Design a protein around this nucleic acid. Structure first.
Ligand SMILES: [Mg+2]
Lengths: 419, 474
DNA sequence: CTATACAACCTACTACCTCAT
DNA sequence: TGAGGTAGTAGGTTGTATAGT
């Protein structure tokens, strides 16, 4: 007995249609044999088609595309229906599915040129109705439709190649955790030594004015050249708040809450960063929010670091990988690094107009892919590092903040095969 | 080395209750959730606007392919896709003429030029809708470029085109057009002459100004799926959503106009499982905060909103929902929530969830070009987690955020819940955007549309509109 | 009234993300 | 798809409190 609807098609040209027809058909009740569902591994594989065409194939559907007619495999596939067209001795055994807007008669195979036009050209839906309605006129067998079958296939077959797979993969963060924090955080009732009108960010250390007291990780002794007549402050006088407590929230002072304290460290950390880049070998791109730091041309041999290419060329403009430091306390204090692409026409002189930059950055960005963005950033952190395990951020002479160059790694079972 | 759990991708359910992951495929495969009697399409455009729109209706019947049809699925064509006809033969046209366009358009003010073409279209739409015996499912506003080009703030028509000097020394036309048409509910789908006819709009070089050969199949998916939704039926539903949840999305917009800069309109948008959505319009208060750079509500208005949502839900679903998540991008003041608590039935669980796309934990896959696939999440606390709604998607073999993806912090600011369900439900909620038909959106549909919604609140403020479904606010 | 010592905006500027899609 | 628009976020500019005449 014969029930099937064999679909002969060109791939990958008519794959979008062939896949649409079969699944739509399969869902509708029909039994469709198409190369699309299987993953054949046999010599018979041609045979399987022949056996299926020979015996169990109720209808031969052929994709009437220009490619389909000129295709060696399809033409071979076609050969049988004609061979088997007679045996059935049913006129309508072979059905050109004319899906192509542009078929010259000359292209069309003679056997099927003769045949009636199943027009998927004007609309795909009418063609399905027409293909089906033609099925009604001749009693082509069907099962009650279960679209469940339709997308079991789609979900299982078509989607087979790519889907979430239980695979293991680790991802490197851009949160590089702070390692060590000054043992205390102290506040100096600087008072007379303190002048409000002065700006400390030429004070070469992280300093900020809170209330009337003075805030930093530099011991009071730290500012001399730029803050005179302060050998007058008792060592005792300033508050000395346990840092190892603050993150905990162990410190809540009704006068100042930990949330207040938590915010405060951050201007320093960032400032601490801001200074260190003052003397860490990188010219800084300034964006209003904070600085972006990009190494100038030729600082690294042939403009590469640790095998990574942190400076390059686009068009007439050199691009320079750059980074920024957000510092965040929570959940785990870390230095957050967002990556940038600065732009210079010439190796060390920055481009004037962002619009050119914004265009540059988008244009340049397209080239870098997850793999590229990670390597350059890690290296850049790798680049800054003043030692094997970490960077050095200088609050004060005896007080330093150390942040791991290598960012946190997250390991997740569940990932996808790379295409 | 922290560890990432993975959230299985939610399945949205299409015709025959058969569910999958890509609406484009889900519709292409089986069709919409509720097949609908054919769309009757009214056009509110230049006589040219009709031909182009007709170019589209005619165009979309035939399949239209994207550049790569794995990353963007192809469009089989409307009838194959939605099992119904959006016929170009069947258009119900209310014309506009350059004379109308020129006369109104040219005014020196942008606003007097904007507000009036807006008025022009509505009368043309309104007259057709109210008056017609004949019925149109969607009114499509085909905006000549000349309207788009000049009907926005910050766009300066030369002093050498303006017929009348400004009478005296918001303004986005389309949003306004939706806003004015808001009081009498009609579905407005706004199209640009350029998008429909983009190869008929060459630049000086003679190449088209904006060239869509790559994504042409895509456009149809976005337009039709939106057109389908407005015209009646939802394309799809969330596949396995536990009964009786309420997702509520809090939307505000600052009203710049007020002398006191706290005058921001308020809304909440209610999503259950369909994403057809209901927009509860809140009235205007001192929501914006100078010190806090935040949006917030007084209890008495706050109580009305939850109630307005709860009651409408009940009128809708014959019971009070056993779980209500209120999403917003901000933390909740204890007083504001406590207003929420009081309105709520005793055994209903109310969760506040702050979905903040702050720039954290950009995660770079160690090996390969592609990024972390979407659904990976890192859970900070029982309360707080990071969700990747963006990132490589294998059905697509493409990344959804075209740069390395930025996960969204999710914190149950107020309320108690299982963070794993939260991440789940939010991953689910990116799947419900009828208007932009994509595999999933970055943001859950609760907060996805707020920025667009926010204009709409303010743009029309006299009105006290009833709670309404999205197609009205889209 | 009017000095300023401060508070809290408002403003670029940039990385994302959207739509008259 | 991409030329757009939005949304973070700092701050310096700015509009309000304090304070002393
Ligand atoms: Mg839209």
């Amino acid at each position: 007995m014969r029930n099937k609807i064999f679909i002969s098609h060109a791939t990958p040209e008519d794959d979008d249609f062939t896949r649409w027809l079969s699944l739509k058909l399969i869902g509708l009740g029909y039994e469709v044999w198409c190369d699309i569902l299987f993953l054949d591994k046999g010599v018979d594989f041609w045979s399987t088609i022949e056996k299926e065409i020979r015996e169990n194939t109720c209808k031969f559907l052929i994709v009437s595309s220009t490619a389909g007619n000129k295709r060696e495999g399809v033409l071979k596939e076609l050969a049988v229906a004609t061979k088997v067209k007679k045996h059935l001795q049913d006129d309508m055994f072979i059905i050109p599915l004319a899906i192509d807007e542009n078929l010259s008669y000359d292209d069309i195979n003679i056997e099927i040129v003769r045949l009636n036009a199943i027009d998927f050209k004007k609309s795909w839906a009418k063609g399905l109705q027409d293909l089906l309605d033609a099925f009604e006129k001749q009693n082509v067998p069907k099962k009650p439709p279960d679209h469940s079958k339709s997308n079991l296939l789609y979900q299982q077959i078509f989607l087979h190649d790519k889907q979430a797979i239980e695979k293991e993969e680790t991802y490197d963060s851009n949160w590089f955790p702070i390692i060590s924090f000054p043992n205390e955080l102290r506040f100096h009732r600087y008072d007379w030594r303190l002048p409000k009108q002065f700006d400390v960010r030429t004070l070469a250390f992280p300093a900020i004015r809170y209330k009337e007291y003075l805030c930093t990780f530099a011991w009071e002794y730290d500012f001399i050249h730029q803050l005179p007549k302060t050998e007058t402050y008792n060592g005792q006088e300033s508050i000395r708040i346990s840092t190892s407590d603050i993150l905990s929230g162990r410190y809540d002072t009704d006068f100042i809450r930990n949330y207040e304290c938590q915010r405060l460290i951050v201007q320093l950390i960032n400032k601490a960063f801001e200074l260190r880049m003052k003397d860490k070998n990188v010219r800084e791109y300034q964006m209003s929010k904070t600085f972006a730091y990009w190494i100038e041309k030729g600082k690294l041999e042939k403009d590469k670091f640790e095998k990574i290419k942190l400076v390059g060329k686009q068009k007439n403009k050199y691009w320079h990988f750059g980074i920024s430091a957000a510092g965040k306390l929570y959940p785990s204090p870390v230095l957050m690094v967002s990556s940038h692409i600065i732009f210079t026409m010439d190796g060390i002189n920055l481009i004037k107009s962002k619009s050119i930059q914004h265009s540059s950055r988008r244009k340049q960005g397209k080239n870098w892919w997850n793999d590229k963005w990670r390597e350059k950033l890690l290296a850049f952190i790798r680049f800054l590092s003043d030692d094997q395990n970490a960077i050095y951020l200088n609050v004060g002479s005896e007080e330093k903040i150390l942040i791991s160059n290598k960012p946190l790694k997250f390991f997740g079972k569940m990932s996808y095969v790379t295409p | 080395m922290k560890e990432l759990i993975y959230i299985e991708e939610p399945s949205i359910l299409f015709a025959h209750g058969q569910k999958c992951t890509d609406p484009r495929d889900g519709l292409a495969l089986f069709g919409p959730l509720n097949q609908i009697y054919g769309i009757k399409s009214g056009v509110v455009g230049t006589q040219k606007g009709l031909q182009i729109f007709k170019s589209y209706l005619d165009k979309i019947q035939k399949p239209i392919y994207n550049h790569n049809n794995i990353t963007r699925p192809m469009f089989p064509g409307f009838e194959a896709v939605f099992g119904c006809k959006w016929e170009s033969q069947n258009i119900v046209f209310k014309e506009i003429t350059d004379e109308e366009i020129r006369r109104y358009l040219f005014n020196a003010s942008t606003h007097k030029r904007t507000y009036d073409l807006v008025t022009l279209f509505n009368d043309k739409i309104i007259t057709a809708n109210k008056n017609d015996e004949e019925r149109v499912d969607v009114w499509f506003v085909i905006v000549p470029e000349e309207i788009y080009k000049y009907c926005r703030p910050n766009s300066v028509l030369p002093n050498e085109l303006v017929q009348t000097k400004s009478l005296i020394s918001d303004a986005q036309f389309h949003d306004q057009l939706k806003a004015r048409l808001l009081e009498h509910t009609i579905p407005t789908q706004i199209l640009r002459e350029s998008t429909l006819a983009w190869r008929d709009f060459k630049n000086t070089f003679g190449a088209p100004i904006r060239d869509f050969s790559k994504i042409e199949g895509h456009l149809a998916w976005t337009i039709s799926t939106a057109a389908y939704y407005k015209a009646g039926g939802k394309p799809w539903k969330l596949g396995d959503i536990r009964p009786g949840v309420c997702y509520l999305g809090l939307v505000y917009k600052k009203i710049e106009k007020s002398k006191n800069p706290q005058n921001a309109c308020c809304a909440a948008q209610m999503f259950l499982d369909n994403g057809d959505g209901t927009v509860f319009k809140g009235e205007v208060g001192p929501w914006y905060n100078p010190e806090k750079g935040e949006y917030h509500l007084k209890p008495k208005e706050a109580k009305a909103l939850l109630t307005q949502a709860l009651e409408s839900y009940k009128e809708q679903n014959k019971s009070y929902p056993k779980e209500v998540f209120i999403h917003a991008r901000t933390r909740f003041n204890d007083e504001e929530w406590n207003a929420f608590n009081e309105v709520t039935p005793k055994n209903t669980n109310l969760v506040g969830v702050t979905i903040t796309k702050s720039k954290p934990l950009k995660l770079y896959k160690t090996e390969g070009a592609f990024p972390i696939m979407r659904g990976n999440a890192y859970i900070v606390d029982e309360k707080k987690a990071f969700l990747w709604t963006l990132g490589f998607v294998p059905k697509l073999q493409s990344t959804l955020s075209m740069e390395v993806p930025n996960p969204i912090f999710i914190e149950i600011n107020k309320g108690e819940a299982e963070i794993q369900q939260v991440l789940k439900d939010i991953l689910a909620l990116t799947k419900l955007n009828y208007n932009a038909c994509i595999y999933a959106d970055g943001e859950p549909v609760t907060l996805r549309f707020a920025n667009k919604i926010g204009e709409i609140l303010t743009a029309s403020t006299e009105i006290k509109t009833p709670p309404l479904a999205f197609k009205y606010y889209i």
